[PDB]
Design a protein around this ligand. Structure first.
Ligand SMILES: N[C@@H](Cc1c[nH]c[nH+]1)C(=O)O
Ligand SMILES: N[C@@H](Cc1c[nH]c[nH+]1)C(=O)O
Ligand SMILES: NCc1cccc(Br)c1
Ligand SMILES: NCc1cccc(Br)c1
Lengths: 408, 408
């Protein structure tokens, strides 16, 4: 007998589980459309070269890679952002900016779960913090659409520019990304301190700034007109004006684990402190330059996974099982009525209704039970006596003779 | 500079191409919902064991497989049906039958294109040809929804039971699947004859039956009540009653390339003879038994690829480029108006409209051009003078002061 379990670390989505996923994805798509983003996609299989960043990232450490028979280094994508950039770089001057692009790719890792889906939202060609404002509002909107409130979740926001200063002022920029990657692990002090020491006083200044509790305190240490300060202030003013001020807050400890973030960074969290980050992202104004773009392309975006949000929605009782539904179930009284019932099935579907016909041979009561089990709104019985009168029998599930034309 | 081209044999879907794909997929989903099918999914990565069928199929010959670091034999799925069966077998007695399940998986091959998406539709637990009738009507419905008519396309239908008789009557059933696989290649007689000879008179009887031009001729060679004859007659009567008689026809040469088909088989084709099969499928009543099910589970279904249909739709001029659209573009008169414009953006989106706000700093005329480029129905200018009167300026793209409450 074949193994019924899926491959290690991978999920099956039979109809029940698929409905839950579709509930979530419908929100990702609806939110993207509400915010004017355009859908895109790219292959799950990409060249391994795309992810060679040399900053010790967890994402590139845990890569699901292999070699083709042709001897090429490939990987199932651990994230989408490099694929986006490849696509953007491929378009070059032909791409109208600004561009707002989204996708919901399955991404992969190897080490526990080995795959997840991850809603991606990115804004390309916008220098100002309005990009990050929109991105954060979009994540909040998705969560609000799922039934969560600002009492359940928030988005913590910071800028890597603050720390950038401090790293630079201690005397080599090529260690900044590695530094962010390390400092990302902060929530074991002994471990993180030691990691920085391996990378080559400045550790104390890093730790201090991370623990600064407000923007005013940041301004005291970098002036009220440091790059980060004006941008964060503008960011918060704009989110407030959009009406999502209760969802967002400053946290100097947020850097994210990815090498390529240059500016504002953010992550979503549950206000009970029970789950990992709901989503995360930021600005990455240099990535396209590192890929070989002749002109710097400003970019910002986030990823929003399909696992943590579901855990949280389950905890909050916001994922009721919503059963399957169909508008009509057409029941032939017996097999002699099947051709007639097919003609009725056609009419109903032509009118835009979802409809089944009883496919096997079964008695009316068992047909009706079937209708109830599949969540039919209406059972339509096609019987000899009614048919002669140009009618069927209709019965609402959530009896009466009805003429054919009046069914729709 | 990074390679901008996707990995060999794989497609990128920037927004333009993604719109075309979504046009198609929307039809696959809409048709599935109209026909009462339930969505499911499973991992693209499956155990290689799932596809070890030993019948010389092209599908298993051209498999995109590899070995994990853990030393397990895995593959990116070449088709979905084995994954379905694994899922069905895993559920066992807990699954309500009949079940109608669909998916739109990306499937893979290695040899030219290496991936495609393939709409899958399967009906489980229905012994009678009503299953095949519904499946074929669903494929026709999808094609009609895409703008094609019965003058553009048809579905050729046959039963492997006819040939089964002839193979059996020549004296070993374990060669039947291999025989179908070979005979599938018929449209080079020298090649096909020779292939059968390698497998071990009976070749002449096989070729003759394949060339029988009608069901009446089949009935002459197997009697008017052979299994296949009554089932094909019933099949055609039912499709006729549903109103799709002009879409379907008998063709004794259709066997399909897959080992597991036992009964009716079918494939879609363009009536100009320009393209490969649009779709294909049939009944496979024994697959679940070969996987170890203690009770035989009747099954039928088809796959419908995303490549040939697009070629045909392009030929027929049925794939116009449909540009991006958004309902509103909100334009701050200048940066002082950005907070106010964000409040307006919120209102519009709250009402279910799709809306952008100009994110960068730009003059009104360039903002308006942007609005036109992204396919805005309406431009909403948020200016100082109007705002004081509790209004914005609205202008339809496909000017006037409008009070805030009246925008939605
Ligand atoms: N790729 C990032 C999220 C992101 C998308 N765009 C920008 N950032 C991640 O996986 O966490
Ligand atoms: N798996 C078959 C189609 C199919 C789905 N269900 C039954 N048949 C193919 O790839 O051609
Ligand atoms: N934490 C990032 C990640 C990346 C790919 C797959 C999974 Br599951 C998780
Ligand atoms: N012809 C079957 C097939 C299977 C997987 C991928 C492609 Br492209 C084609």
């Amino acid at each position: 007998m074949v193994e019924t379990e899926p491959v290690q670390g991978c999920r099956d989505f039979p109809p029940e589980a698929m409905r839950c996923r579709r509930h979530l994805f419908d929100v990702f798509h609806a939110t993207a459309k509400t915010f004017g983003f355009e859908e895109y996609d790219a292959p799950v299989l990409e060249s391994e070269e795309l992810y060679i960043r040399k900053a010790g990232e967890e994402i590139t450490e845990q890569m699901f890679n292999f070699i083709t028979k042709g001897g090429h280094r490939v990987a199932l994508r651990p994230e989408m952002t490099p694929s986006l950039a490849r696509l953007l770089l491929g378009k070059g001057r032909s791409l109208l900016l600004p561009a707002k692009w989204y996708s919901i790719p399955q991404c992969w890792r190897y080490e526990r779960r080995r795959e997840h889906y991850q809603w991606n939202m990115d804004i390309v060609g916008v220098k100002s913090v309005s990009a990050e404002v929109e991105l954060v509002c979009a994540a909040c909107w998705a969560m609000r659409s799922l039934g969560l409130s600002s009492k359940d979740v928030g988005i913590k926001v910071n800028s890597r520019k603050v720390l950038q200063t401090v790293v630079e002022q201690a005397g080599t920029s090529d260690k900044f990304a590695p530094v962010c990657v390390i400092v990302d692990k902060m929530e074991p002090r002994e471990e993180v301190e030691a990691q920085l020491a391996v990378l080559g006083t400045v550790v104390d200044a890093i730790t201090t700034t991370l623990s600064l509790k407000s923007i005013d305190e940041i301004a005291q240490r970098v002036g009220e007109e440091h790059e980060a300060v004006k941008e964060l202030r503008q960011f918060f003013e704009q989110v407030e004006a959009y009406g999502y001020g209760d969802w967002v807050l400053f946290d100097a400890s947020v850097v994210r684990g990815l090498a390529y973030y240059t500016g504002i960074v953010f992550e979503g969290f549950d206000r009970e402190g029970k789950f990992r980050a709901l989503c995360g992202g930021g600005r990455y104004d240099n990535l396209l330059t590192t890929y070989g773009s002749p002109t710097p392309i400003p970019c910002a975006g986030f990823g929003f996974g399909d696992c943590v949000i579901v855990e949280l929605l389950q905890e909050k009782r916001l994922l009721p099982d919503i059963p399957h539904v169909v508008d009509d179930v057409v029941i032939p009284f017996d097999e002699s009525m099947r051709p007639h019932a097919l003609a009725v099935l056609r009419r109903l579907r032509d009118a835009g209704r979802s409809a089944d016909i009883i496919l096997d041979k079964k008695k009316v009561v068992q047909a009706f039970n079937y209708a109830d089990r599949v969540g039919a709104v209406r059972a339509v019985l096609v019987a000899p006596e009614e048919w002669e009168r140009g009618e069927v029998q209709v019965k609402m599930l959530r009896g009466f003779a009805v003429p054919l034309d009046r069914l729709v």
